[PDB]
Amino acid sequence: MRVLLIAGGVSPEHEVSLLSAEGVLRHIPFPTDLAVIAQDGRWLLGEKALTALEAKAAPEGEHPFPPPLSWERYDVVFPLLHGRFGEDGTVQGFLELLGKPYVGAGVAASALCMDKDLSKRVLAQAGVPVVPWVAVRKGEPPVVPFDPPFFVKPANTGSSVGISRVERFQDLEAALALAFRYDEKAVVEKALSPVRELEVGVLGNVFGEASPVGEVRYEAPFYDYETKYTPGRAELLIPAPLDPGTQETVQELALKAYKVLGVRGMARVDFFLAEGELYLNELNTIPGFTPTSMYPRLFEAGGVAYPELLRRLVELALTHHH
Amino acid sequence: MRVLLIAGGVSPEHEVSLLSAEGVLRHIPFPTDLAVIAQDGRWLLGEKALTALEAKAAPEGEHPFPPPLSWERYDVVFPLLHGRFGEDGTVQGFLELLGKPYVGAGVAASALCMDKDLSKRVLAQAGVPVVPWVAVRKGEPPVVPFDPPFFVKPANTGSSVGISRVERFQDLEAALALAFRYDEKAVVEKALSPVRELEVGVLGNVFGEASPVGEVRYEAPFYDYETKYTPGRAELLIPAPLDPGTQETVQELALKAYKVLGVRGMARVDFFLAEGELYLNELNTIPGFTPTSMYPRLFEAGGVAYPELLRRLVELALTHHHHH
Numbered sequence A: 001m002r003v004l005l006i007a008g009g010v011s012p013e014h015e016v017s018l019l020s021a022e023g024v025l026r027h028i029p030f031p032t033d034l035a036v037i038a039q040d041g042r043w044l045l046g047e048k049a050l051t052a053l054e055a056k057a058a059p060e061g062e063h064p065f066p067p068p069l070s071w072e073r074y075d076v077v078f079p080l081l082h083g084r085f086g087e088d089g090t091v092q093g094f095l096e097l098l099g100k101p102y103v104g105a106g107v108a109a110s111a112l113c114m115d116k117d118l119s120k121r122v123l124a125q126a127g128v129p130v131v132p133w134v135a136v137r138k139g140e141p142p143v144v145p146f147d148p149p150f151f152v153k154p155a156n157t158g159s160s161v162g163i164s165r166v167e168r169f170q171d172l173e174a175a176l177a178l179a180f181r182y183d184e185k186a187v188v189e190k191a192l193s194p195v196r197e198l199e200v201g202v203l204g205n206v207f208g209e210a211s212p213v214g215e216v217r218y219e220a221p222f223y224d225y226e227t228k229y230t231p232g233r234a235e236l237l238i239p240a241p242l243d244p245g246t247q248e249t250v251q252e253l254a255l256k257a258y259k260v261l262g263v264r265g266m267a268r269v270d271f272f273l274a275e276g277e278l279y280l281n282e283l284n285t286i287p288g289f290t291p292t293s294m295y296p297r298l299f300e301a302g303g304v305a306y307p308e309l310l311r312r313l314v315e316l317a318l319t320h321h322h
Numbered sequence B: 001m002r003v004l005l006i007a008g009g010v011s012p013e014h015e016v017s018l019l020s021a022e023g024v025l026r027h028i029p030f031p032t033d034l035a036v037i038a039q040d041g042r043w044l045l046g047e048k049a050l051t052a053l054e055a056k057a058a059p060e061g062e063h064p065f066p067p068p069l070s071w072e073r074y075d076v077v078f079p080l081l082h083g084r085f086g087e088d089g090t091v092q093g094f095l096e097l098l099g100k101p102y103v104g105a106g107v108a109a110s111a112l113c114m115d116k117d118l119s120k121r122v123l124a125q126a127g128v129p130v131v132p133w134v135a136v137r138k139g140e141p142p143v144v145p146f147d148p149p150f151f152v153k154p155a156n157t158g159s160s161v162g163i164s165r166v167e168r169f170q171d172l173e174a175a176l177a178l179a180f181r182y183d184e185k186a187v188v189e190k191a192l193s194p195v196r197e198l199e200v201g202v203l204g205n206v207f208g209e210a211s212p213v214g215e216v217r218y219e220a221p222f223y224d225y226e227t228k229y230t231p232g233r234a235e236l237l238i239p240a241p242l243d244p245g246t247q248e249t250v251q252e253l254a255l256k257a258y259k260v261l262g263v264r265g266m267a268r269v270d271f272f273l274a275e276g277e278l279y280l281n282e283l284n285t286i287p288g289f290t291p292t293s294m295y296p297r298l299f300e301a302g303g304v305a306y307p308e309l310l311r312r313l314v315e316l317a318l319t320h321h322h323h324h
């Protein structure tokens, strides 16, 4: 059984994805080759990918897409890319057309969970509590019916890139300008403050199994990029110090969202807790596997060891593809 | 300006796709090469693609994906691939990775508009009237809160394939079994009976312009596959006989849905009319271009001739990929 693991990517989460690949490669129990997508979109294979892994960033690649890769030599593809062009259904569409089993969410689930506006519309209709928000298109003025503080985001982002906590209505124009450098659509959400951030891992095809609930504790004004990936800046509380009824509701809501969106393989489902009210923040279908990442730690605490977790992901890929 | 037209596909709408390619190739005002995805997922190129188009079906292809062709030579790709894998975001995702402009909706809008459950969830959330429905997954006990008559559908279908009109609870099991031959998820909708069917074309990126409203009438119990593609079976009324307030309301609803879903390039937006009561039925991001298809006729009535409609689709693809 040969696995092809793809990491890097052209999204702002390129470096995060190479850290994820280091984590997965340390534990995956199958023979596994790495393929790296550089920041310019060109791929690196063989020894050049392993070199780029060691540098933790590859700004330039060798082969334009699609790469001269002998796909038939691999049984499963593990797309370990985060964000645009990797977690959003693009890579998944390519792999579906390749006819190759692959780890994680299909095209629709991936595209929808990446879009913070569309996912919120689906989940809100399904009865899942979400934060008040509006969508904003580039070149169009925002119509924000709620009062600040706000969070402003590109609709398709990850690792808090392009996100701003906005406290003045006057700072909203600059915040949207920054958001529009990453996407043609943005979301303005009502900021919850104070807020506790809860995350729960799901594993399985449509009908999921939930991990224990974890909590993110930090000092920064929000869980920003620097706080997410700088060692020691975030404390992951596993399991979270959470009252029993809320813990139960987090797991029920995560599994319901997972099923409604038809997610396969895995997701990390993230929630806000403010004044005793739960809100589903987002699903992430390719969660990070970095040394500061929550998803593998959550399942390790729930009795699913890191090599067992990757085995299940690979086996869920084979099972769905039949 | 060179176009690569892709048609065929592995979905049940493979033959309809080849018919649409015949119509687009007749009028497209650009040099256009044809690639055909055969029903087995292997591709046909060059002379074999044109031969297969003449045969109107291609069960067996030659080239495993990804096909041996230079994508760099094409300025735009026009996926004319109805249904699963072609209209549902899959081919769009591959084309995004090529860095290639392409006609029509992107990955998320394509995936949403092909799923009859998730599109309805988004549209209902935005306040768009839609028929009562539930989603049923394979192996799950169907929990339907309303009484029959039902319409049962594969969640990802087109051209009415796998759809049953269900009059009695006893007939629900056979209808779900039929729907589950095509998808792992199905929808059960409350049937409207009788009902008029309205369709409106949209053109543009996110902020579209609507064609005149057309209406489809027919003798069959519903707008089934045979009625859709038998010459003369379907009556296509353009403009629809509606009072002007209703016409504007249909066009505004189609543009609202188009914008909420983030559709690009084009869509045909289809509605039900039940003694004045309006429901959005579905959006189709790759509508048909067959000799009995509504989308080109609708924009024809709106003063956009067939070659100009196809030009604008290619122009809209270039305007989105570059610049945005």
Ligand SMILES: Nc1ncnc2c1ncn2[C@@H]1O[C@H](COP(=O)(O)OP(=O)(O)O)[C@@H](O)[C@H]1O
Residues within 6 Å of the ligand: A116, A131, A151, A153, A157, A158, A159, A160, A161, A163, A189, A190, A191, A192, A193, A195, A197, A222, A223, A224, A270, A272, A281, A282
């Ligand atoms: N509505 C909100 N209220 C409070 N904090 C928020 C809100 N939205 C985002 N944040 C903060 O920003 C972080 C990143 O937001 P998120 O939507 O998860 O984007 P990403 O997918 O990039 O992580 C969250 O973990 C949280 O710290």
Ligand SMILES: Nc1ncnc2c1ncn2[C@@H]1O[C@H](COP(=O)(O)OP(=O)(O)O)[C@@H](O)[C@H]1O
Residues within 6 Å of the ligand: B116, B131, B151, B153, B157, B158, B159, B160, B161, B163, B189, B190, B191, B192, B193, B195, B197, B222, B223, B224, B270, B281, B282
């Ligand atoms: N809820 C409904 N009530 C009445 N007729 C329906 C309903 N749903 C579908 N139909 C009939 O079936 C046809 C096909 O259904 P539709 O959802 O548009 O699927 P497709 O994408 O296969 O065309 C419709 O044009 C209409 O004639």
Ligand SMILES: [K+]
Residues within 6 Å of the ligand: A113, A114, A115, A157, A158, A282, A283, A284, A285
């Ligand atoms: K996400």
Ligand SMILES: [K+]
Residues within 6 Å of the ligand: B113, B114, B115, B158, B282, B283, B284, B285
């Ligand atoms: K559709």
Ligand SMILES: [Mg+2]
Residues within 6 Å of the ligand: A157, A158, A159, A282, A283, A284
């Ligand atoms: Mg995220």
Ligand SMILES: [Mg+2]
Residues within 6 Å of the ligand: A159, A160, A270, A282
């Ligand atoms: Mg997040």
Ligand SMILES: [Mg+2]
Residues within 6 Å of the ligand: B157, B158, B159, B282, B283, B284
């Ligand atoms: Mg349809």
Ligand SMILES: [Mg+2]
Residues within 6 Å of the ligand: B159, B160, B270, B282
């Ligand atoms: Mg239809």
